Every structure is written in C-alpha cells, then in structure tokens.
Amino acid sequence: MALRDFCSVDGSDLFWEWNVTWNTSNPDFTKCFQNTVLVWVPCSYLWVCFPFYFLYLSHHDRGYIQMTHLNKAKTALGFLLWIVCWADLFYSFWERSMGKLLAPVFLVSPTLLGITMLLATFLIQIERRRGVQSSGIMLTFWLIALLCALAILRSKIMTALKEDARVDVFRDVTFYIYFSLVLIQLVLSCFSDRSPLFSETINDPNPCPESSASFLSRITFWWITGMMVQGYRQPLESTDLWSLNKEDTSEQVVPVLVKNWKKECAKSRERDPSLFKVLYKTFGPYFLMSFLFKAVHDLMMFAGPEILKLLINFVNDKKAPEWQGYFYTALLFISACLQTLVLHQYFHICFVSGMRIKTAVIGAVYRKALVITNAARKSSTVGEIVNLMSVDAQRFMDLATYINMIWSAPLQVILALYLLWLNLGPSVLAGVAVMVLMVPLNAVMAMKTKTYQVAHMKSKDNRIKLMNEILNGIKVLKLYAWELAFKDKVLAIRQEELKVLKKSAYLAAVGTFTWVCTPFLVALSTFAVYVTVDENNILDAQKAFVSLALFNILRFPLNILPMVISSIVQASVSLKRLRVFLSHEDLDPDSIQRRPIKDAGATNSITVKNATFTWARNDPPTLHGITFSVPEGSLVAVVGQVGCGKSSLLSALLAEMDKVEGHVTVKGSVAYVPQQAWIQNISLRENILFGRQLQERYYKAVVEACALLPDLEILPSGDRTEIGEKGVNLSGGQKQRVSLARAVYCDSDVYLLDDPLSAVDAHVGKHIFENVIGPKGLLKNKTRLLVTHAISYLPQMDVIIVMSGGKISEMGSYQELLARDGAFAEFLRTYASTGQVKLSVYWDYMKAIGLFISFLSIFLFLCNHVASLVSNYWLSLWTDDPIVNGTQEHTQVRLSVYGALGISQGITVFGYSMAVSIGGIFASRRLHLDLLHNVLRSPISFFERTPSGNLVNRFSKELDTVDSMIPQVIKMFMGSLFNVIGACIIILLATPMAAVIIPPLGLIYFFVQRFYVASSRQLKRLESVSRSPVYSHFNETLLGVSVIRAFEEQERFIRQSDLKVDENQKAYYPSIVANRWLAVRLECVGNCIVLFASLFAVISRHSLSAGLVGLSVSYSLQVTTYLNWLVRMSSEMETNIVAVERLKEYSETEKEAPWQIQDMAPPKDWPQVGRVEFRDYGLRYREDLDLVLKHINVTIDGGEKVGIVGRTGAGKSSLTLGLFRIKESAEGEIIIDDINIAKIGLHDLRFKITIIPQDPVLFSGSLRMNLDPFSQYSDEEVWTSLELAHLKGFVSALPDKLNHECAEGGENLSVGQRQLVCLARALLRKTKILVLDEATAAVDLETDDLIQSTIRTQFDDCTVLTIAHRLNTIMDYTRVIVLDKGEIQEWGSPSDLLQQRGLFYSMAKD
Ligand SMILES: *[C@@H]1O[C@H](CO)[C@@H](O)[C@H](O)[C@H]1NC(C)=O
Ligand SMILES: *[C@@H]1O[C@H](CO)[C@@H](O)[C@H](O)[C@H]1NC(C)=O
C-alpha cells in the first residue's frame, strides 16, 4: 500500500488502471499518475543531467556573456515559476493546519518541482557565466516539462469541463499559470543571446558558423544551408570556406599529442611505449559520446518493427479505440526522428575525431622528421616516411567511423536474432543461415574480381605506355605512314583488356544478383520451414512483415562486419608503423655547444678538442680525434683525398653526426650550403631570401656578385621565375649558384661550404670566388670553412687543413706547406695530377552501348521490379488468409507461387546485370576505337597545340572510369530509383491519400539534392587540391632537413605545415557537414513518408486488410535508405558521366585529308632515282603567323645529291615537313613523276618517299617490328641493312639474332648505337630520300664518318636532300640550293658558290 496510500489517505484513486488509461474511448492519466510521474520525470532529468553538465562546463569555458534582456527575462521567469510552484505548497500547509487531511503527494511533488525550477534558473545563470549561447540541456528539459504539463493540462481541462466534477480552483489556477510560464520559457530557450565579450574571433572575418549557431540549428546542421545554396548559385573557391574551429586547428591539436607521447616515453624509461595508449588518452574523451549515441540509435532502431507489430494488431482488431493507431503512428514518427538525429550526431562526432587524429598525427610526424637522427632516417626511404601522412594518417581518419561497429554490429545481430526467435520460432535459423553463408560467397567473389582487376590493369599499363611513347613520336609515325599498324597493335591489347572485362562482368552480374535477391531468399527459407514444419504454424501479418523489417536491419551489421575487421587490421599495421617512426632516437641538441657571437671567450668561432663522430653507434667512427680551431673571420680550407672524411666535418659541426667523445663549440649564426643542392618548389627569388625582408640593394648586390644575372636572362620572368615542380629547367651549376646566393643573403657569421663550386666551371667559378667568398669577396670579413678539391684558389686562403682518412694531418698557411711539403706535396703531385551535364551525353553513351541492349536492360529491370512488387503483394494476400479448423488453406499454392515469383525475379536480375555489363564493354570498345581513329587521323598541329597530358589522361583515366565505374553506377542508380518508385506505388496503392502527400513532400522538398549535388562536388575538389600540397611540403622538407636545421628555420616550416594541413581541413570539414545535412533532410522525408503511410492506414483501418498495412509500413521503413542511396548515386553519376563527353571531344576537331582515296590511284613510279620538284610552293606554320616558305619554283630530274643551306629559322625544317605534305599547301603545288601529290590521299604517297629526323625514334618492341611493323620484307634484307649498318656481327652477338626486343627510343642501344640503328632503319626500308636535319652537329666524327662513307657506297645511288650546318660533310654534293628570308636566294654547284664568295661561302668561312 506504499504507492496506494501515497495517492490518498483512503487509497481510492489507483496509481494505474487500464480501466481509464488504455481501454477507453477517451484516455486520461489518473490523478496520482499525473501528480507523481508527470512531475517527477522532468525533475529527474534535470537533476541527473546537472552533475555531468556542470562537470563539462567547468572543463569548457567560452568566456563571459552580459546580462541582456533575454537572459534577464529567463531568470525572472524562473524565479516566478518557483514562487508559483511553492504557492500550492503554502496552500497545502494552510489546509493541513486548518485540519483538512491531505495526501503526501500534494506535499512532496510541489517541493521537488520548485527546487528543480530554482535549479533551472541557477544553471541558466551559470550557463551565461560560462558562455553558451543556445543551451541544449535547457531546451530538452523545457520540452519534457511542456509535454508532461500538457498532458496534465488536458486532464484538468477535461475534468473542469465536467458539469458535476469538483474543482480545486486554487491548484487549477496555479497550474495554469505554471503551464503558461513553462511554455514561454521553452519559446525563449529556442533563441540565442549575445556572443561572449571575450570573442577573439572578431579579427577573423569568416568564422565557422557552428561556433555561434543555435542548438536546433546544430542538430539539423542548418548552418551550412547558406553555403550549399551559394555553391549552386555560384562556384565555390578556397576564399569562401570558413575558418576552422580553434579546437580543430593544428596549433591546438598537435601539441597535446606531442606532450602525451613525450610523457609516455619518459614513463617507459624495458617496455616499449604504446602509441595506442597515447591516442586513446588523447582522443577518447570526445569519442565516448560516440558510444553513447550509437547505443541510443541501435536501441531506437528496433522501436520500428515493434510499433509496426502493434499497428498491425490494431488494424486486425476492430474493437480497439481509434486513437490507439494515432498514438502508435505518432510514436513511430517520433522514434524515427530521434534515431536520425542521434545517428547523425554520432557520425559527426566520429568524423571530427578522425579529422583531429589525422591533424595530430601529421603534425607529430612532421615535428619528428626534423629531429630524427641520421641512422633513423637512413633506415627507411623518404617515400615511406611520407606515407606516414599519405596513407598512415588517412587510415586513422577513416577507422574512426568504423571502430564502433565492432561492438554495435554484434549487438544489433543478437537483438535481431532474439526478436526473430520471439516472433517466428526457431525457423529463423533457415534465414540467418542463408545470410551468414552469403558473406563467404561475396568475399570469395570479391577476391576473384580483385585478381581480374589487377590482371586487367597490368595489361592496360602496356597500352598506356605504348600510348605515352607513340604520341611522343607522332611526327615520325605520320611521316613513315605507319599509323594503321600501331592502331592494330593497340586494338589487340584492347581486345585482351575487353576479355578480362567480360569475365569481371559475369562476376558482377552474379554479385548484384546476390545483393538484390538475398532478402527474398531469406524470407522464402524462413517461411518455408515455418509453414512446412507444423500445420498449426499460421502466417499472419505480424509474423511476416515484422520479420522482414528485422531481416533488413540485421542485414547491414553482417554485410559490413568483415570490412570493419579488415580496416582494423590495416590500422593495426599503420599504428605499428607510426609507433616505430615516432620512437626513433633524436639528435642530442647539447652535443654541439652553441654560443652567442657577443661572447668574448676567444677569438676563434670554431673550436674542436679530441672530437670523434660516427653516423651510428654500431658503425665505426669516421673522424678520429680531430682537434683544431678556426680564428674569427678566417678563411680556412680543408682539402684532401676524396672519401677521406673532409666532406663529413661540416656535417659533424652541424650536429648531424653523433658525437662519441670530445668538446666542440661554434659561435654566432651558421650558414650552410651542402654539396647536393636543396631547392624548393617556389620562385628563385623567394628561394634566395629564404623568408626574409627584401632589401633591394643588398639582393641586387648578392645576385650580381654570385653571377646569377646572366642566368636569369635565359629563363622568362627573371628572378620572379618560379622553379616549378622540382626544377623545371635548373641545372647543377644553377642549383649550386642559387644555394650559394641564399647562403650569402642570409648574412650569417660562420659559413660552412660543402664545395659549392664542384658543378661549376672555372671561369664563372673564379668569378664567384673573387666576388663572394675569397679575400676580395662579399663576405671577406666573416668566418668561412671551405671543403673543395680546387688547387688554383687554394693559395689565396689564409690557413689550410689537410685530411687523411678521418684524421688531421697538418694545418697551416699555404707558404708553410710549400716549405715543409708534407701531405700537400703528394696532393699537388698525385691528387692534383561545373554546370549540370547535358542529357545528350547520357543519350550518346546509351547509343554507344546500343539502343537494343539499353532497351533490353530497361525491360528486364522493369520486369524485375514488377516481379518483386507482385511477390510482396502475394505475401500480403497469403498473410490475409483465414483460420479454418486450426490451419490455413492454400498453404502449398501460396508457397509455390511465392517461390516462382522469387526465382523469376532472380533470373531477371541476373539477366539485366549481365546485359548492362555486356553493353558497357560494347560501349567501351566503340568509344575507344573511335577516339583512337579520330586522334590518329588528326594533323600534327593538334598534337603540338594540345599538351600530351590531356591525351594520356583521356586514354587512361576517362576510359578507365567509363569501363569500370559508370556501368556499375547505372546498376545502383536504377536500383535505388525504382526501389523508391516501388515503395511509393505500394504506399499509394494501399492508401491513395499518399498520392496527396507525395507532391508537396516528394518532388518539392526533394530539391534538396539540387544544392548538395552542386556543393559537395566542389568541396571534394577543393579537398583533394588542398590535400596534395601537405605531402608535397613534407617531401620537400625531408629532402633538406640538414639545411633547415643549419639555418634555424624549424619554426617556419612547422608553421607552414600547420597552414597546409589547416587549408586541407578547411575543405574537408564542410564536406562532412554537407553529408550530415543531406542525410538529415532525406531521412526527414522518409520519416514523414512512414508517418503518412501509417496514418492513412489507421484512418482506413475498416477497409484495409491488415496485410496491406504491414506491407505499406514495411516499405516506408526502407524508403529512407533508398532515398539516401539514390541521391548519392545520382551525384556520383553526374560527376562521373562527363568522361563520355571528354572521350568524344575530338570527334569533330579538324582531321587530316582522306588517308586512302582509291579513285585516282597512281602507278608504281616510287621515289627511286630521287627527284625533287616545286612550283611556287608556300607553307606557313599557322596562317596568322608569317609565311615560312614563299614561292619555291624548281624542277630537277632524279639521281642528284643536293643539300639545303640557310641561317637560323631560314625555312629548312619547314621544307622537310612540307615534303610529305604533312601541312596542307595553302598555295603552290608539288608534283612528282607527273602526279599532283597535293590532292591524292596522303597515305597513297607517304609510303612512297622517305625521311628521317635528327634522332629517329625507336619503339618498345621487337627490332623486327621496328624495322617493319608489317614484316613484309624478308629477314635476309634485314641482315643486308644490318651489314650496311655495320651491325650484323654486333646484332648476332645479341642473344636474339633477328627478334632482339628493342627498348623505347633506342634505350637498349647507346646514343651512338641509337643513331646507328636509325641509319639501319633508314637503309632497311629500301629508301631513296634521306635527311639529316641538324643531326650533323649531334653525331661524333667516327659514326657519321660511317654514314658518310655509306652515302659514298650505300646511298651513293640514293638522293639525299639534307640540311647540315656542318655542311663540310656534304660539300662534295653536286649542287646546293641556298634559301633565306623564307624564299630562295640562288642555286648552283658548290664550286661557283665558293668562287663567288657569296652568302654560302660566308657561312663556309664561319
Ligand atoms: C472504469 O472505472 C470503474 C471503476 O471501478 C470500473 O469498474 C469500470 O469497469 C469502468 N467504468 C466506467 C467507464 O464507467
Ligand atoms: C475493455 O473495454 C470493453 C468495452 O467497455 C469492455 O467490454 C471490456 O471488458 C474491456 N476489456 C479489458 C481487457 O479491459
């Protein structure tokens, strides 16, 4: 009677009774339940949330806020609420003093309500003090209080409306005004007050809105709506992204990880420190909220099927009051909304934690790379140290979203199995077995398609390299007329790729069959066992449609669990890698005693006493007991035998090498120039200043003194000229010169130079020695350590040190070492001896597949979905069957028809997948054949104007995404779209008012994809573009760690790395928030759809059949996942289909003349005799430029040897290009053997003359293929050419006599042998006309002597119309035609040209 007497002294009003609360046409809570629970639940929530929230606020202060009107009103309303709450308490005390007996509840509930109201006021004050603008706890507390007070208000209004019930006017009016105040407090809690007075973000012009967004705007992610609208209205660039939150900046994230790791390493000082412990301690506090939210979402997920069971029971029962269904549908909608909010908060927390982990790891790795010892860095390679940011920190980034799965997915699986066992008996095993047996099948198939993928990509790389080689040699290919052979070879390689693609297509067909038809298979197995095991097993709507809704939510934790565990093991290997790197021994800072230049301890800037060093503890010491001192300002030299240890003394003095024993000290700033130059990917000028103020006078002085002024003239922009990506054109001497210039401009005290002169010749060498470093140099009043192998500059230098195998042989001035003649005696003697993609792109891709295959695929897909819909409707009918004599009739027929429909769906799914995949390979074949033909038919002009990068990208990446990506996107997009359509048609067929709700909610509010699609695509682009520079900077800083450490520039580079990481996160964060935004909106659409389906089912409960209701609600439960899939796949289609537009881009660019036109085929005159003819010819590179060739008229019979002579840009190479009409003759004409070659199809003539460039290119393949791709000539002719190429003996000396594969461009042969092979090809093709365009100056006087003697013996008969600037080889030619100014000067035999002392003789004298 504890609860019963607590109601009243007589215990008349019961605490809970279905008599009034549930089994009645008008529900209402009994007065005890109101006055106890409806007032204890909000008090309980506030008092349980205060401890944790106060602990969090004490650990999280955002400053201070003024007392504005809003907060003053909220405090005043809180105090008024407490006094009005104690009003009824005082009334009850007065009544008890009056003698009237009253219950304990009236004397306990108001007390707790008043104290919790005062608590709310106090916590609102402390929230103001601690700087929170929109309270989350208060909003939910007020919402709970308003809901409970609303229930009590409805009860009280109903009771008062009774014309016989007693009314307690005092308590009624007190509760009325309490309700009004609570409602106004809730409406005020939605607002936000002024920003904190300590808002340091005032300087920041573009802060992240999340810092100052309301709680409602924060759970719905509304604050990114402006960004997503703008991203569709106009393009988004990096200038528009918001600044990061202070808690996300690397300057606030990296130090905590660094400090925690240092603390644990110190603790371990045995047992190796564990990076997992540090990462956990550092990032778990913000990650446990993820566990809480995930648990809440997992629990709320199962509230769907149970409420569906209740709704089905309500529809079947026709004696239950109508409001029960409305209660159920409201409950379902509320649960779905809460679940979506909680899940997306969980995802946000996980993603932000991953972002922070990535930032911290990148920063810690960067800061460690600058202090790792030389042995540690030399253990690994720079490409593997960079991978610590490239892959090893992205794995931690992505695992944060999957780590929680390891406990959530088993929980979901066990809950689903338990509910299935409760709902449908042990026959659930028949479906869980099919689902568990499915995952080994798809894992095996994934491996079997991974092997096919790698096998196809390895075969595709052959074509890709063949492309990268052929386009590089397009001119010679066009010039020989060999394009058909290479077209055929590429086509064969494409055929191999397409076979592999067909096999992968079969695999993908079976895979999508499994993925689509697994739920039907599970349902069939379960229902078959359940109904066949026992006759009394009756399939009802709550057994079938509750089981399916639970099978769907058991599907996901099983299908994604193997991926999660694989990701965990990969992250384990990642963490071991990072732990090994971060545990490396670091340089001992105090081994090198640095002291300020102001110290007057002694007049020597460098001192050393018995110092020995080594690059590793175990390795033997290199420098042995050196002891020397360098007086301040002296110019000291260290010269000795190479490899004897002179080149390591500077590095030892820079603290690079471990100091085993000794005592050395260096004063002042240190400037260092290493032997291997370090150059950044920035402008030459910025590289020279190395981050200092530009003093124009001093900068000019150092650049002119360092002899850089002639160098900046060659490159376009001068000092402003950016070095580009890793030295666009900088040579070794240029690199050393700019490094030295940076060293001088730094203006340090001691200068350690590791032979900056080595890669520089003597002339400008001695120039810079005199101007910058020597006794007359720029820094002649500084301390300089020189290690160099030069002799002539040694005498000027003050005191000289000679090394011997890591020991100090002797030191002194140069006169003294002349006198004693010690080590330097031998040294001188021996050593010195956009918008939306057009629909026409989709249409032309559909044509590329084939309209027949496309129609077949669409027909099969529609058949699949009609089969599935009819199957679900048939299941509904089966569950609608009656119970007669304890058993259901028609059981066998229902089961058989269900099975038949399912197998029809399965075979149809398999068919449509195979059809679309085969059509995809068909399209991939035709598109590539067309692209190749169009490119190979285009003129050379298009080849020079279009950078080769675009063509290789078009052939590799666009073709790859067309072959592999888009056919699968078609699968998934069609699946999602028609799943959504099927759900909608089911819903609106069961209840046609769904047709009313769908327009104002489906189409209109589904234009939220118009913004996400436009904006996320831009944001991911920015993310990748900003992701690359972080790794670029890490590599660039790893290359030059010693230089940075010498100049004391560690802070600058750490700050730059921080900026690069922050710029990448600036684009990464909006992408995550955008995903959350779209997910919230789409799941809101789905929740509303399920609400309306259930609500119209409740309205039409008297006409629906209790099986249609379950079907509609079950499909509505899936609508949300289908919508998310559809939007994501629509975006992934839009951003990826443009590859088809790109692959057909050159389908209309102007092509060459018709290759082979057979209407006027010529006779077999051939060029043999070597005739040359021109009739007022004229050619020009591009018609807007100047005519390089003007009015050439000549007609000479064959059998002659004429060379062509001219000055720079005279018209020689243009004539060579115009010989084979490779450029269309604007004016004039050329006729050979009475054939107008300017008209006939160029293939019909290009094979019937010959030409060879300066360096004729070879190809990756057999020497037989290079000599003849058609291989029509007999191998005896091959050997003929080889002997006339002076190679038969050498070629036979190769392992393969005739088919020895030759590398690209003749790499398998030396450059001299390469030109020998080019001569070999030239002769081998049975040729007449040959040319050496500038080749005379690039070939040594022995091999070109061979080629000349061949023109005397082999091309004695052949006609050579060449251009040799070293025409001394061709003076013996019968005649020479001299041309200049783009026109013919004169002609004749070389004799009278010599005697006339003319222009030709003027170049002859040169
Ligand atoms: C609900 O209340 C009374 C209380 O005894 C119960 O006997 C009866 O079944 C119900 N009476 C109504 C609805 O009048
Ligand atoms: C529920 O309400 C009906 C109608 O008043 C009544 O006949 C029935 O006895 C009640 N059944 C239960 C279990 O409360």
UniProtKB/Swiss-Prot annotation:
Upper classification of the organism: Eukaryota, Metazoa, Chordata, Craniata, Vertebrata
Question: Main localisation, per the record?
Answer: membrane
Q: Which residues lie on this side of the membrane: Extracellular?
A: 1-33, 96-100, 155-172, 300-325, 424-426, 531-552, 868-904, 990, 1104-1105
Glycoprotein among keywords:
yes
Residues bound to ATP 1 are 640-647
* A Pfam family reported for this protein in Swiss-Prot or TrEMBL: ABC_membrane
Q: Which residues does the UniProt record annotate as the domain ABC transporter?
A: 606-830, 1172-1406
Positions bound to ATP 2:
1206-1213
Q: Write out the function statement from the record.
A: Mediates export of organic anions and drugs from the cytoplasm. Mediates ATP-dependent transport of glutathione and glutathione conjugates, leukotriene C4, estradiol-17-beta-o-glucuronide, methotrexate, antiviral drugs and other xenobiotics. Confers resistance to anticancer drugs by decreasing accumulation of drug in cells, and by mediating ATP- and GSH-dependent drug export. Hydrolyzes ATP with low efficiency. Catalyzes the export of sphingosine 1-phosphate from mast cells independently of their degranulation.
Compartments reported by the entry: Cell membrane; Basolateral cell membrane
Q: Activity regulation per the record?
A: MK 571 inhibits sphingosine 1-phosphate and leukotriene C4 export.
Q: Which family does it belong to?
A: Belongs to the ABC transporter superfamily. ABCC family. Conjugate transporter (TC 3.A.1.208) subfamily.
Superkingdom, natural source: Eukaryota
In the UniProt record, does the keyword Nucleotide-binding occur? yes
Reactions mediated catalytically: ATP + H2O + xenobioticSide 1 = ADP + phosphate + xenobioticSide 2; an S-substituted glutathione(in) + ATP + H2O = an S-substituted glutathione(out) + ADP + phosphate + H(+); sphing-4-enine 1-phosphate(in) + ATP + H2O = sphing-4-enine 1-phosphate(out) + ADP + phosphate + H(+); leukotriene C4(in) + ATP + H2O = leukotriene C4(out) + ADP + phosphate + H(+)
The record gives the membrane topology as: Multi-pass membrane protein
> Which of UniProt's keywords are assigned here?
ATP-binding, Cell membrane, Glycoprotein, Hydrolase, Lipid transport, Membrane, Nucleotide-binding, Phosphoprotein, Repeat, Translocase, Transmembrane, Transmembrane helix, Transport
Q: Per the UniProt record, which residue ranges are transmembrane?
A: 34-54, 75-95, 101-121, 134-154, 173-193, 279-299, 326-346, 403-423, 427-447, 510-530, 553-573, 847-867, 905-925, 969-989, 991-1011, 1083-1103, 1106-1126
State what protein this is by name: Multidrug resistance-associated protein 1
In this chain the ABC transmembrane type-1 domain maps to: 287-570, 854-1135
Tell me the tissue specificity.
Expressed in heart, spleen, lung, kidney, skeletal muscle, mammary gland and weaker in brain and liver.
